[PDB]
């Protein structure tokens, strides 16, 4: 699978 | 940089 994190503050992960 | 494609439908792609 593929996991990616973000950073703006705002910050999420996505993932599948 | 680095950009990511997201799909969930919601699409997004962010980048730095
Ligand atoms: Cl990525």
């Known amino acids: ?3 990616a994190a ?3 503050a ?3 992960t996505t993932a599948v």
Chains 1, 2 share one sequence.
Do not use: G, M, Q
Request: hydrophobic letters at 55%.
């Open 1 to 3: 699978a593929t996991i």
């Open 6 to 8: 973000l950073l703006s």
């Open 10 to 12: 705002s910050f999420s």
